[PDB]
Design an enzyme around this catalytic site. Structure first.
Site, short mmCIF file in Angstrom:
data_model
loop_
_atom_site.label_atom_id
_atom_site.label_comp_id
_atom_site.label_asym_id
_atom_site.label_seq_id
_atom_site.Cartn_x
_atom_site.Cartn_y
_atom_site.Cartn_z
N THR A 298 0.92 -1.21 0.08
CA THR A 298 0.01 0.05 0.10
C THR A 298 0.90 1.35 -0.06
OG1 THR A 298 -1.87 -1.12 1.23
CG2 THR A 298 -1.77 1.19 1.15
N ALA B 86 -8.03 -2.58 5.86
CA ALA B 86 -9.09 -1.85 5.03
C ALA B 86 -10.40 -1.81 5.56
CB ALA B 86 -9.21 -2.57 3.65
#
Lengths: 238, 217, 201, 213, 240, 202, 225
Positions: free
Chosen positions: C1, C49
């Site tokens: 990420t 997430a």
């Protein structure tokens, strides 16, 4: 006279007058009729509007795919008991994956409403219900009372001016069993019509119908879905 | 139950034309010790349902106690309604999932048989809430030893008779007495038909030991 | 990420990857890691997430009620401290969140970094994720508060590109936003294979 | 000691179109190296427009679907309408985060119809992070199915190609082709292939056999 | 006044609410129960207020266990509740001790639950008396009645409701200690038909139940072929 | 520990050793592992002394209250069931092996074993403890249905003597007890009264 | 029988619940009108001093971008129920990611009146908004009774205002015309000169959110009167 201001008080004649007074709140709601053949169970109501330029109050409620009620009395008690029924049926489908019988629901309703009759600080439920359902024993019509009592019925009408509908149904009970759906709905509508004045008559706006059977979930027909069932009624003179 | 103490081994099940049959040995083993040898691990639930269990016998007694009172309370109302086998199956799946979710499980694995409204029922539930339906079941080492024999017949002849099903069951128990070590040659058979639940007494399999004379052979 | 955000003359830029990953397998390459909390606030996703999404939707639910009760749009500092004090009541239970709160209020362009550990910092440059260290370099040599808008766009785009080049758990597209005084505006969604061509030759 | 989880196999797939949506699955249920049954589909019809797939631990697969079925009825009671695909997805996102510290070991895929008739596919994690997609695979062979879908549906790493939209008859052949190949290398992919097609006219079902090895 | 609460005494040590709760049983239809040599038989005078009610509504004979039956007179919701309590008592007894509850013990456990409602200001007393009946090979036949006050006594024959006097005056004629259940059925139906008054209230239904050897300690509704054969005897003995 | 119970027609016979160890040290060599729950219902105690003593006291309380409020003598199944509920509800916290033997007018002499996990099962002869492993064969090869009181006393003494001779955590004194309608007799065997068996010399 | 909400009259009545209805006529009057173009809400403010800032008199409020409420009765009850509606509309968004309908907001707000808090709520509310089913107007009463209405008037002069709406209403109207009719009815039940501070007005159209009118937009309709 002075054994009336509380539900935990008996009278010298062995009566509880608050319960008898709660039963008088069913007579303030509009009239409902319930009846059953050997295949189907029917509820027909007569809706009532507050202002002429508003919508009519809804009288029939969906509880599950095989049970439904029509209410006469206080709205709040009906809205509480319907939400009780719905969760009691979901709780049965969750555990057993079967629909809850109707006798075992009305027994629970009675067990629930019996408490305010005996303990102080709570009001008796001033609502009467006619409960139409279908289970592994056929169709059923149940009356429920503010006295925490309940009856199994061939047919019944409750609410204002319901004695006329009851008198009608009492002399046509011998036909309802082998009646098809159209004739049964028409008997219900005629018993309901017997509760009106001679001035008024049945209309799309003020009639709701609820039907449940073997091959039919509990459906409700309100405004324009009713006009098939009205077509056929003899235009009664007085 | 975080560890089992007295245990029961495999239970079998197979459908036939107009009923179901279940079989289970009459032993409760305390480790590798055959300590109790005339205990019944098959249950007489209402005339449309029966139950057999493998694993901790105390938990099986608990379920025997709870289901009994459920069925009694159903009978006391007298209104023409009774719990189908599928209802008992769902209730047990819930009862074991809820215990799994508290980490206080019920150390059982059981086989539900029944007959209602013309169709047969055979069901499975595990400690964790894993449940399914098949025409043939086997818990424990039965799943390795017996179930291959049941399936092989039910792919060449999916519909069985009571007689063939009984023969197949007894063959499977004959194999389990040979190759399972926590087994016992005294078992029960229970059957459901329209007549209802009929349990049979202590039954034994005749065993052959001709291969023992093959040292030089 | 990989995420980044810097505030300059004409507001705040926000850029992010589009990759999700479960170990070595690439589950998704179309992930929207910039969370539109409100029409006047933006978030980011790094870590959990499901933690990023749930708690920022919960933040939106409180921001709207604030605006209704008080008839004034919330500040960025308040919006950040709500989230910080919410995720501090689950400290040590195992939440993983790293997210920037971006927006404009009566004080000016605002940027706040919030972590599930309990950090809450205001700054002009932040990057979060595994590829943050590869973006910090480019975005530090290329920064200026007096940058132009297209230059800022190019800087964010190229920093995310260079982060995706090295890091294995970073790739896909580059979704770029721009915070202003009239709300925010989505700018681009550029595949890294496209930018490879233009930034090679 | 008592571990409360076990992997019961399972494989699920969904593809979206402009006027349809498919949700497919195998029918094998497993336990370690053994096979429980060869008739245990992972697909469940929720509404006339929506279908869900569930794969992983089977107890949670059974509990969660009942919870969803019980929440749909409550929605219909309170709001007098059936739910949409996105509302079911967003509700499941909360039902899953309700167990953030004891999760449902379930890999979920929703497939249905948008509010203008277009297809819709929502893929979930065990803790509720959801993502609208065009196609997604889930379960034990998820690593094996998604490349060929990326190629033959997304047209990836293929130049000078006709970017034709996927019709139903092509999608169904493609869906069968991927399970026919996943039954050759994955040991949990098993006996039959259930396919539930969703269209404006309703919901169909189709069973297709696979190798029993 | 001194007659508005059950937490209150009068200057002569009386609690008038508990008596007013018995006045409600006096105004209800009549039920009787007779203890035979090998079982117990219940009979109820079941009134049909309207022809719209099905045959089987307002059942006043209840199964509390697979060896115990219950007949009630008074308020019916109260009776259904007390039946639900008598069921969980016997349930927990089997759950804790592992065998069927005796009736002397069940009667005490329900009598105390009923007596607890005679002490407080937040509740009224129960408005129903009721009989319990059981049969066992060891404990034999048994019949107890429980009043609103919480009193519980054993019986050979008993009645509750309007025609209590008229019914016991007929039950004392019976030599019940000599007879079997199938012969006492005739007498139970005869008494219910003697005490029923057609002018004071409309038509009625006869409701019967059994427990004894012939049911193997299982409380049962009487079959139809025997209930009709007894209702006939009731009609033919009304020629008197 | 080595406990044992047998039923005959009139009633039951019970038996137990007298040793209580703490590792390898013998803390009490004259222990009384037989315990009256009621006038004609006994407990043979194995396992943790604390847990089992507490369970015995509690069940005595329960059964006394029950029997007084019924005003009839209690069953053996009842006491056994109370033991079962306590040993099963607290099976993760108790190490308790129990045998319940007594007499009741309804069913007569009865024997109920309640092992650690809390299952219950009626038996003709029940053996429990740490020395039962060494006599599981003897009691199977020597038991015969139709034994009187004295033959059962002999059987129960011969078994416990062997279990005590081999088991290190068992020894001392054989405490017997016979129960029937007439009452409860109790014996104590010690010294030469304990049966002796041939110990090989070659 | 009159005092206490757990006591029935001999005719089966709850006089405290009726006296909660009577507390609505002590509030100023509000009007709501349906139209296929949208919904309107129009109210009197009843300013008691020129010193008080009349914007601090919240008689029309935003529940969401698609629902607006108008109230009459007790202020505290209104604050409670408006907070309830606002919270529910956002819990619905959080869970399902969509807009709650006016029927369901009204249903959920009426369920608090079904709780004997020890006192009935002395406030009636009109809910005007736009849904999948188009513009909708609802009316909630202290009894927890709610119903769809095409035009409704609550408050002090509800009787005369309703007796006028039944004449000026038809199911073909426009919004600019209904706004004119509402203010014409409001003019006739006031002993104060109608002006752009003695009234509020709001609308909720399909393609536009809740919008409270301004002094400019108000005076530009007061002029054509």
């Amino acid at each position: 006279n002075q054994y009336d201001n509380d539900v935990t008080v008996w009278s010298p004649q062995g009566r509880i007058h608050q319960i008898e007074y709660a039963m008088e709140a069913v007579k303030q709601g509009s009239a409902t009729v319930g009846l059953k053949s050997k295949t189907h169970a029917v509820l027909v109501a007569l809706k009532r509007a507050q202002s002429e330029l508003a919508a009519h109050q809804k009288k029939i409620l969906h509880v599950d795919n095989h049970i439904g009620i029509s209410i006469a009395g206080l709205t709040a008690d009906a809205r509480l008991l319907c939400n009780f029924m719905r969760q009691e049926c979901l709780d049965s489908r969750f555990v057993f994956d079967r629909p809850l019988p109707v006798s075992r629901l009305v027994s629970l309703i009675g067990s629930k409403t019996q408490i305010p009759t005996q303990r102080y600080g709570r009001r008796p439920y001033g609502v009467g219900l006619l409960i139409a359902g279908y289970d592994d024993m056929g169709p059923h019509i149940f009356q429920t009372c503010p006295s925490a009592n309940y009856f199994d019925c061939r047919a019944m009408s409750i609410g204002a001016r319901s004695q006329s509908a009851r008198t009608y149904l009492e002399r046509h009970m011998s036909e309802f069993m082998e009646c098809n759906l159209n004739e049964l709905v028409k008997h219900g509508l005629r018993a309901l019509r017997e509760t009106l004045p001679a001035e008024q008559d049945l209309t799309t706006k003020n009639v709701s119908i609820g039907i449940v059977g073997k091959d039919l979930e509990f459906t409700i027909y309100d405004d324009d879905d009713v006009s098939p069932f009205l077509e056929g009624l003899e235009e009664r003179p007085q | 139950t975080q560890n089992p103490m007295v245990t029961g081994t495999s239970v079998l099940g197979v459908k036939f034309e107009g009923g179901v049959v279940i079989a289970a040995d009459m032993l409760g083993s305390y480790g590798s010790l055959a300590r109790f040898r005339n205990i019944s691990r098959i249950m007489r639930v209402n005339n449309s349902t029966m139950l057999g269990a493998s694993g901790d016998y105390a938990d099986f007694q608990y379920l025997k106690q709870v289901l009994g009172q459920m069925v009694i309370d159903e009978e006391l109302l007298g209104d023409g309604h009774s719990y189908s086998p599928r209802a008992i199956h769902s209730w047990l799946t819930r009862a074991m999932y809820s215990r799994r979710s508290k980490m206080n499980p019920l150390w059982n694995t059981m086989v539900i048989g029944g007959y209602a409204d013309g169709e047969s029922f055979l069901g499975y539930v595990d400690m964790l809430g894993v449940a399914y339906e098949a025409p043939s079941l086997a818990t424990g080492y039965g799943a390795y030893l017996a179930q291959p024999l049941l399936r092989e017949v039910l792919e060449k002849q999916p519909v069985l008779s009571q007689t063939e099903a009984r023969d197949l069951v007894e063959r499977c128990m004959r194999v389990l007495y040979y190759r399972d070590a926590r087994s016992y040659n005294r078992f029960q058979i229970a059957t459901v038909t329209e007549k209802g639940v009929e349990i049979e007494g202590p039954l034994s399999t005749e065993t052959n030991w001709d291969i023992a004379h093959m040292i030089s052979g | 990420t990989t995420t980044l955000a810097f505030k300059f003359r004409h507001g705040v830029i926000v850029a992010a990857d589009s990759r999700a990953t479960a170990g070595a397998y690439i589950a998704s390459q179309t992930v929207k890691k910039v969370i539109e909390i409100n029409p006047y606030l933006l978030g980011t996703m790094a870590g959990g997430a499901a933690d990023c999404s749930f708690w920022e939707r919960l933040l939106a639910r409180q921001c709207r009620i604030y605006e209704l009760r008080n008839k004034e749009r919330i500040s960025v500092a308040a919006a950040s401290k709500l989230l910080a004090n919410m995720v501090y009541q689950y400290k040590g239970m195992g939440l993983s969140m790293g997210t920037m709160i971006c927006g404009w209020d009566k004080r000016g362009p605002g940027l706040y970094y919030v972590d599930s550990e309990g950090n809450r910092i205001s700054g002009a440059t932040f990057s979060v994720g595994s590829g943050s260290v590869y973006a910090y370099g480019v975005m530090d040599r290329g920064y200026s508060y007096d940058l132009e808008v297209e230059q800022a766009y190019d800087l964010a785009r190229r920093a995310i590109y260079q982060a995706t080049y090295r890091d294995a758990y970073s790739g896909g597209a580059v979704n770029l936003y721009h915070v202003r005084e009239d709300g925010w505006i989505r700018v681009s969604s550029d595949n890294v294979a496209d930018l490879h061509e233009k930034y090679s030759g | 000691r008592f571990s409360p989880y076990v992997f019961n196999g399972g494989t699920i797939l969904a593809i979206a179109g402009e006027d349809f949506a498919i949700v497919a699955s195998d029918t094998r249920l497993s336990e370690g190296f053994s096979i429980h049954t060869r008739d245990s589909p992972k697909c469940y019809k929720l509404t006339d427009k929506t279908v869900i797939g569930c794969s992983g631990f089977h107890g949670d697969c059974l509990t969660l679907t009942k919870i969803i079925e019980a929440r749909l009825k409550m929605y219909k009671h309170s709001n007098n309408k059936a739910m949409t695909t996105g509302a079911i997805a967003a509700m499941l996102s909360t039902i899953l985060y309700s167990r953030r510290f004891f999760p449902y070991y379930v890999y979920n895929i929703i497939g249905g119809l948008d509010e203008e008739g277009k297809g819709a596919v929502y893929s979930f994690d065990p803790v509720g992070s959801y993502q609208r997609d065009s196609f997604k695979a889930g379960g034990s062979a998820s690593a094996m199915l998604q490349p060929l879908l990326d190629n033959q549906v997304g047209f990836k790493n293929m130049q000078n190609v006709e970017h034709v939209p996927l019709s139903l008859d092509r999608a169904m052949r493609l869906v069968k082709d991927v399970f026919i190949s996943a039954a050759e290398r994955d040991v949990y992919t098993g006996d039959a292939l259930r396919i539930c097609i969703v269209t404006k006219e309703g919901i169909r079902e189709e069973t297709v056999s696979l190798r029993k090895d | 006044g001194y007659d508005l609460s059950a937490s209150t005494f009068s200057p002569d040590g009386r609690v008038f609410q508990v008596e007013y709760a018995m006045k409600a049983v006096e105004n209800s239809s009549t039920a009787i129960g007779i203890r035979c040599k090998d079982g117990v038989v219940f009979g109820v005078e079941k009134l049909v207020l309207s022809k719209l009610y099905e045959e089987g509504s307002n059942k006043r004979l209840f199964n509390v266990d697979r060896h115990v039956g219950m007949a009630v007179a008074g308020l019916l919701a109260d009776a259904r509740s007390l039946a639900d309590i008598a069921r969980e008592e016997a349930s927990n007894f089997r759950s804790n001790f592992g065998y069927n509850i005796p009736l002397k013990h069940l009667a005490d456990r329900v009598a105390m639950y009923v007596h607890a409602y005679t002490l407080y200001s937040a509740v009224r007393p129960f408005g129903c008396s009721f009989m319990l009946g059981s049969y066992s090979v060891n404990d034999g036949a048994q019949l107890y009645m429980i009043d609103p006050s919480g009193v519980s006594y054993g019986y050979w024959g008993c009645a509750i409701g309007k025609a209590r006097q008229a019914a016991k005056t007929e039950i004392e004629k019976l030599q019940m200690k000599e007879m079997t259940c199938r012969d006492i059925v005739k007498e139970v139906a005869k008494i219910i038909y003697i005490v029923h008054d057609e002018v004071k209230d409309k038509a009625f239904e006869l409701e019967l139940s059994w427990v004894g050897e012939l049911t193997n300690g299982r409380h049962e509704i009487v079959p139809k072929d025997i209930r009709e054969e007894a209702e006939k005897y009731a009609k033919e003995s009304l020629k008197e | 520990t080595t406990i044992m119970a047998v039923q005959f027609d009139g009633g039951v016979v019970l038996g137990a050793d007298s040793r209580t160890t703490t590792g390898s040290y013998i803390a009490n060599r004259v222990t009384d592992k037989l315990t009256p729950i009621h006038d004609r219902i006994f407990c043979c105690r194995s396992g943790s002394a604390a847990d089992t003593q507490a369970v015995a006291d509690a069940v005595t309380y329960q059964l006394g209250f029950h029997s007084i409020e019924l005003n009839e003598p209690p069953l053996v199944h009842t006491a056994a069931s109370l033991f079962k509920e306590m040993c099963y509800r607290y099976r993760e916290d108790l190490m308790a092996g129990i045998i319940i033997a007594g007499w009741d007018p309804q069913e007569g002499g009865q024997v109920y074993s309640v092992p650690m996990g809390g299952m219950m099962v009626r038996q003709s002869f029940a053996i429990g403890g740490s020395g039962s492993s060494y006599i599981y064969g003897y009691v199977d090869a020597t038991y015969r249905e139709g034994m009187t009181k004295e033959e059962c006393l002999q059987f129960t003494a011969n078994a416990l003597a062997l279990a005590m001779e081999r088991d290190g955590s068992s020894g001392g004194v054989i405490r017997l007890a016979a129960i029937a309608e007439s009452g409860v007799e109790r014996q104590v065997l010690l010294g030469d009264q304990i049966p002796k068996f041939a110990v090989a010399t070659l | 029988y009159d005092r206490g909400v757990n006591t029935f009259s001999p005719e089966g009545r709850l006089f405290q619940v009726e006296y909660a209805i009577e507390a609505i006529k002590l509030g100023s009057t509000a009007i709501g009108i349906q139209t296929s173009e949208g919904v309107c809400l129009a109210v009197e403010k009843r300013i008691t001093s020129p010193l008080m800032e009349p914007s601090s008199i919240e008689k029309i409020v935003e529940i969401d971008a698609h629902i607006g409420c108008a109230m009459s009765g007790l202020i505290a009850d209104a604050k409670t129920l408006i907070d309830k509606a606002r919270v529910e509309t956002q819990n619905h968004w959080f869970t399902y990611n969509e807009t709650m309908t006016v029927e369901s907001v009204t249903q959920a707000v009426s369920n608090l009146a079904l709780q004997f808090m020890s006192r009935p709520f002395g406030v009636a509310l009109l809910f005007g908004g736009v849904d999948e089913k188009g513009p909708q107007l609802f009316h909630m009463d202290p009894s927890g009774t709610f119903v769809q209405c095409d035009a409704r008037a609550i408050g002090s002069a509800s009787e005369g205002a309703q007796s006028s709406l039944q004449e000026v209403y038809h199911k073909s109207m426009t919004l600019k015309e209904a706004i004119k009719s509402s203010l014409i009815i409001l003019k006739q039940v006031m002993e104060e000169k109608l002006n752009a501070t003695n009234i509020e007005l709001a609308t909720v159209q399909p393609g536009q959110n809740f919008h409270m009118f301004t002094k400019e937009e108000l005076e530009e309709v007061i002029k054509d009167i």
